[PDB]
Amino acid sequence: LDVLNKNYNLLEHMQAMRRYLLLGQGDFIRHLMDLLKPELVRPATTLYQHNLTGILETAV
Amino acid sequence: SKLMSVCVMFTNCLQRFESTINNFDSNFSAHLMDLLDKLSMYSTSDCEHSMINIIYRLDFNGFY
Amino acid sequence: PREIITLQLGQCGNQIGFEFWKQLCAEHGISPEGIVEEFATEGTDRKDVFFYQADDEHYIPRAVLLDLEPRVIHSILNSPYANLYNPENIYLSEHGGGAGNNWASGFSQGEKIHEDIFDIIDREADGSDSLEGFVLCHSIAGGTGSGLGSYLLERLNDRYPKKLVQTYSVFPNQDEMSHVVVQPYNSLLTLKRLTQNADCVVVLDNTALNRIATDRLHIQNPSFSQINQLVSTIMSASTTTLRYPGYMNNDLIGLIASLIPTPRLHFLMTGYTPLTTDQSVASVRKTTVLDVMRRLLQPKNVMVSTGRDRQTNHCYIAILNIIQGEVDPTQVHKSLQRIRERKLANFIPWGPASIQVALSRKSPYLPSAHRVSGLMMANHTNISSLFERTCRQYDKLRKREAFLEQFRKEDIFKDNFDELDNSREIVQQLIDEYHA
Amino acid sequence: PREIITLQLGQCGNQIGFEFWKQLCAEHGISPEGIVEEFATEGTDRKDVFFYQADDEHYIPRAVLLDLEPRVIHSILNSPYANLYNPENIYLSEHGGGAGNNWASGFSQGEKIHEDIFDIIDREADGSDSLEGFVLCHSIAGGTGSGLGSYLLERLNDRYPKKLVQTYSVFPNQDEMSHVVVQPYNSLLTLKRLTQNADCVVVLDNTALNRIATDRLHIQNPSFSQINQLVSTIMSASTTTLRYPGYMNNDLIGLIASLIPTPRLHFLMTGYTPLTTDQSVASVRKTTVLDVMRRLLQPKNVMVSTGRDRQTNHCYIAILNIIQGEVDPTQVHKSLQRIRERKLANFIPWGPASIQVALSRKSPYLPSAHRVSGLMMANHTNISSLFERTCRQYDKLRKREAFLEQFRKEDIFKDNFDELDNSREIVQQLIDEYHA
C-alpha cells in the first residue's frame, strides 16, 4: 500500500472517479454541460468527436 | 497539380493582351468539389487520432 | 461561466457590500493586496465566481458603487481593503454627486448621465461570454438608493433580458418619522419595481435588526456599525453552494428556481442562528445537526416583522435549510425525519410542499470548521402583514396633505399614487388566494 | 534581392520616417556611426532588405527626403542619428524649398526640377538588379506633402511599371478649420491618385491618434512629439516577416497580395494593442497567445474613425493578425480555434473569408523577447464612412464660395472638382456592391 502512494496514487483515483462518473463536484460538470448543449441538440455525425475533445479541454 | 497547370495558362492570358476566364472558374470549382471528395474520404478512414487531425483541418479548410 | 455583477448602490447599499467583499478575503485565505497563504487553492476549489478572474493572482471584485453622497466612499480609501478595489472600474479620486435628498433626484439623474452609466458597467459584462445575471445591492431607505435604483430595474430588463435579477434589499426603519418623513413615498415607488420589473427580492427588515441586536449582542446605544455584521455573513452564506464546491443548486438560478411559487410572490424570509462567540467552548463535544434545524422554523431567528397569531391561516410553501461546514451527513436525513412529526410548517392544502436541505464545506479556518451554521431561506404567506403595515402608513399620509405640493414640482405631472396602491393590493390578494 | 526605396516626403512624412530609421538600429543591435555589438548577425539573420548593403559594415539607409520647408531637416543634423544618413544621396548642407503653402506649388515644382528629381533617386535603383518597389512615405496634411506627392504617383507608374507601389500615408485632422482651410481640396486631389495611380495605401487617421494618445498614454496638452511613437512601431512591425527571417509572406508583395480584394478597394485598417510599459511586471508568468487576438477584432485598438452601428451591414473580407517574438506556437492554432465560435468578423455572403496569422522572432532585446505584440491589418467595408465624411465636407465647401477664385489663378484652367467627386463615389458604390 505504500508503493502506490509513492508512485501511482491508487486510492486517490478512487476519490477521483467519483468527481466525474459519480459527479461529486458539480462545477466540473456544469461548466461542461453548459458548453456541451449546443453540440448535443444536433444529431451526431462523423465530425462529432474532434470538437468534443476540444470542448472537454477548455472546460477543465 | 491541376492548380499548377491553371496558373501557367492564366499568366499566359495576361501577357497575351472571358471564355478562358469562365474556364478557369470552372476549373476552380472542380477543385473545390474534389476537396469535398477528400473530406468524405478522410471521414471514412480508420478513425484513429491521425484521422481526427486530418478531418479537423479539412473541415477547417471547408469553413474557408 | 457563472459570473455575477453586484450593483452596490446608495448610502446603505455601499456599506453592506463593503464588508461583504471584506468577508470574502478572510475565507478565501487571501489578502486584498497580496497572496501570502497557500490555502486558497487546496482548501477552496472555486474562487472565480464573484471575483473577476485573475491576471496576477489578484482576484478583482466585480463590483460597482455609485452614490450621491461622497461620505460613504471617503470612509473607504483610508481602510487597507480599498487597494483591492480598482480606481478605474467605477470612479477615480474625488467622485461626487447631488446635493441631495429626493426620490425624484436620482430618478431624473439617470437619463442625464445615461451615456456614462451604461459605459463602464458594461465593460465587465463581456468579460465572460456566459453571464449569470445582476444583483442590485441597493437600499430602500432614503432617496439616494431608492431614487436611482428604480431606473436600472427598467432599462436592464430589456437590454439584458436573458439574465437573472434578484436583490438583497434592506427595508427602512418605521419607529418614528421625525428625521425622515418621505419614507412611505420612496419605498412604495421602488416596491412596485421590485415585483414586475424584478423577479425576486431578499427582504431585510430594520425593526427586526435591533430585535436581534439586543437579543444576544448586548448593546445599549444602537449604532450603524452593527448593521453590517448580520448582513455580510448571510450574503456569503447564500453563495456557499455557489462559491464553495457543491453539487445541487450550485448556481444562483438554482436556488431561486426551487423557492418562487409565482411572479410577484418572491419575498423570502431569512433566518440565521449562530452569532455568539462563547458557544465555541462547548462545540468540541460533537454538537450534532439534529438540534440546529428545530429552531429554524421556530420564530426566533427571523428578520421579518410579522404577526404571531397570523400563522394558523397562512401556510408555508417552500422552506430552505442550509447547513455549512461540518454536517456529519450520516444524520442529515435523520434531521429531516423529525420534520413531519411536529408539522411546524403549515402546508398548503392545494399542493405539495418541500423542505430542501443542502450542504457545502466551509473555509479552512478554525471558527468555520468547528461550529455548525444554519442559513434559512423561508417563504411564508404571512408577508402581507408588512404590506398591510406599509399600505396603512401610505393612505393615512395622503389624507394629512403631506408631500403632495412639495413632491410634484419636478418631473411628476399626474397622480401615480394609486398606481402603486392597487398593484400592492394585487400582491396582497393573490397571496391569500394562492391557498385554495 | 528585395530592396525597397522609401520615399519620405513632406512636413509630416519626414518626421515619421526619421524615427522609423532610428527604430531600426535599436533592434538590429547597431549604432548609426559604428558597430559595437556582435548581436547583429547571430541574433538577426537578415539586415540588407531596407538598408543599403554594406561596404564597411555601415548599413546605409535607402532613403530620400525632400520637403519645401527647411525646418524639418534642420532638426535632424544636430541629432546623433544623422551621421548614418548621407549628405550626398539626397541633399548637401543648406537645402531649401519654396515659400510656401499650396497644393499647386509642389504640383508645378515637379516639372521645373524634373531633371534633378529623376537623377539622384534613380542611382539607388540600379544598385540591386531585382527591385522590390517604392513606398511613398508622404503626408496628406498641408500642401507640401500633398502637392508634390501627387506628381510622383504618375511618372513612376510608367517609368517603373513592374514595381509594387503601396504607401503608409497619414490622414489629416478634421477637428476645426481655422489654421488650415485648404484641407478638403488638397486631400481629395491626392486621394484620386491613391486609387488609380496607386495600388494600395495604409490609412492612418489623425482624429484617431488623440483617441489613443489620451487612452493609455495620459497626456494633457497634445503635442506633435507623440505622433512619431505610434507610427514608427507599426512600420517596423509590418516588415517583421520581411526584415526578420520568416517563411510565408516574407515579402511586401506577399502580404499585400493576400488582402486586396480588387483595385480601388485597398484601404487597410490597422490595430496595435501593447503600448504600456507597466505591463512588463506581469508578463513573467507566461502570458499566452490565447488572449491577445480576442481584442484585435474588438474595436479598441483601431486607428480609423468609423461608425459603431454600421458594422452589421458591412462584412470583413480579409483580416491579418501578426504575432511577434515569443508566440508559444503549440497554442497558435488554439487561438484560431476560438475565432469561428464568436464570429466577431462579419463574413461576406458571396465568397469565403480568411483569418491569416503569422509569426517571426523579434530582436534579441529584453523589452522585445518578453512581451507579446499583436499587429492587425484588417480590411472592413465600413471605410466609406471616412469617404462619406470627406465628401460631405467637400461639397459643402464649394457652395460657400471658398477657394474657387483663390485657387485657379495658377496652372488650373478647367473645373476638375467633379472629376474627384464621381471617382470617390465610384469607390463608395463598389464597396457596398461588393457583398451581393
Other C-beta atoms closer than 10 Å to the C-beta of C118 total 14
> Which chain B residues are Cβ-neighbours of D353 within 8 angstroms?
64
Which has the closest alpha carbon to D131: D156, D168, D113?
A: D156
Residues of C in contact with A23 (CB under 8 A): 247
Q: How many helices (H) and strands (E) does chain C have?
A: 15, 9
Q: Do chains A and C touch (3 or more CB pairs under 8 A)?
A: yes
Any A CB within 8 A of B52 CB: yes
Whether the Cβ atoms of residue D123 and residue D154 lie closer than 8 Å to each other: no
Distance CA C65, CA A59 (A): 32
Q: Is D149 one of the annotated binding-site residues? A: no
All three cell numbers of C64: 460597482
DSSP state letters, D25-86 = HHHHT--SS----SHHHHT-S--TTTBPPPSSS---B-EEEE-S-THHHHTTTTSTTSSSS-
Residues in B closer than 8 angstroms to D352, CB to CB, are 64
**Using CA atoms, how far apart are residues C322 and C357, in angstroms rounded to an integer?**
6
E strand spans, D295-428? 316-324, 354-360, 373-380
What are the chain B neighbours of A49 within 8 Å (beta carbons)? 52
Number of residue pairs across B and D with CB atoms under 8 Å?
4
State whether A49 and B52 contact (CB < 8 Å): yes
Q: Which residues of A touch B41 (CB under 8 A)?
A: none
Q: Which residue of A has its CA nearest to B55?
A: A47
- Listing DSSP states for D305-334 in one string gives ---SSSSSS--EEEEEEEEES---TTSHHH
Instruction: Return the DSSP state at D265.
Output: B
Q: Is A18 an 8 Å CB contact of chain C?
A: no
Nearest Cα neighbor of D324 from D273, D359, D365, D356 is D359
Give D340's contacts in chain B (Cβ within 8 Å): 63
Q: Are chains B and A touching, using the cut-off of 8 Å on CB pairs and a minimum of 3 such pairs?
A: yes
Return the partners of chain B (3 or more C-beta pairs < 8 Å).
A, D
Question: What letter represents residue D315's amino acid?
Answer: C
Q: Any binding-site annotation on D147?
A: yes
Distance CA C244, CA C375 (A): 15
Nine cell digits for residue C37: 497563504
Question: How far away is chain B from the Cα of D337, in angstroms, using its nearest Cα?
Answer: 9
- Cβ A50–B52 below 8 Å, yes or no? yes
Of the residues A27, A33, A60, the best mutation for testing chain C's interface (the one with the most C CB atoms within 10 Å of its CB) is A27
Cell of B24: 478557369
Pairing of strands C131-135, D63-66: unpaired
Breaks (C-N over 2.5 A) in chain A follow: none
Residue D374: phi and psi, rounded to 5, are: -125, 115
A45 to chain B: nearest residue by CA?
B43
Is D146 annotated among the ligand-binding residues?
Answer: yes
CA–chain centroid gap for C85, Å, is 21
What span, in angstroms and rounded, lies between the C-alpha atoms of C13 and C9? 5
Q: Is the dihedral of CA C144, C180, C168, C34 positive or negative?
A: positive
CB-based contact (8 Å) between A24 and chain C?
Answer: yes
Taken as a whole, chain A contains a residue count of 60
- Is B11 part of the contact surface with chain A (CB cutoff 8 Å)? no
Q: What phi and psi values does residue C267 have, to the nearest 5 degrees? A: -80, 110
**Helix, strand, coil abundance in chain C, percent, nearest 5:** 35, 15, 55
- Assigned C-alpha cell, C215: 437579543
Task: Give the C-alpha separation, C116 to C134, whole Å.
Answer: 18
CA atoms of D63 and D83, how far apart (whole Å) = 13
D12: nearest Cα among D51, D55, D68: D68
Collect all residues of chain D within an 8 Å Cβ-Cβ radius of residue B56. Answer: none
Contacts of C88 (CB under 8 A, 6+ apart): none
**Quick check: B17 contacting D, CB < 8 Å?**
no
- Beta-carbon separation of B64 and D340 below 8 A: no
Residues 338-367 of D with CB under 8 A from C: 342
Asked if residues D183 and D195 have their Cβ atoms less than 8 Å apart, the reply is no
Contact present, D321 and D270 (Cβ < 8 Å): no
Exposure string for A18-44, b = 16+ CB within 10 A, e = fewer: eeeeeeebbbbbbbbeeeeeeeeeeee
Phi/psi-derived region of residue D270, left when phi > 0, alpha when psi is between -120 and 50, beta in every other case? beta
For residue D144, say whether it is annotated as part of any ligand binding site.
Answer: yes
Of all residues in chain B, the one with the smallest CA distance to A53 is B52
| Cα–Cα distance, C428 to A43 (Å, whole number) | 49
- Helix %, strand %, coil % of chain D (to 5): 35, 15, 55
Q: Fill in the DSSP letter of residue C171.
A: P
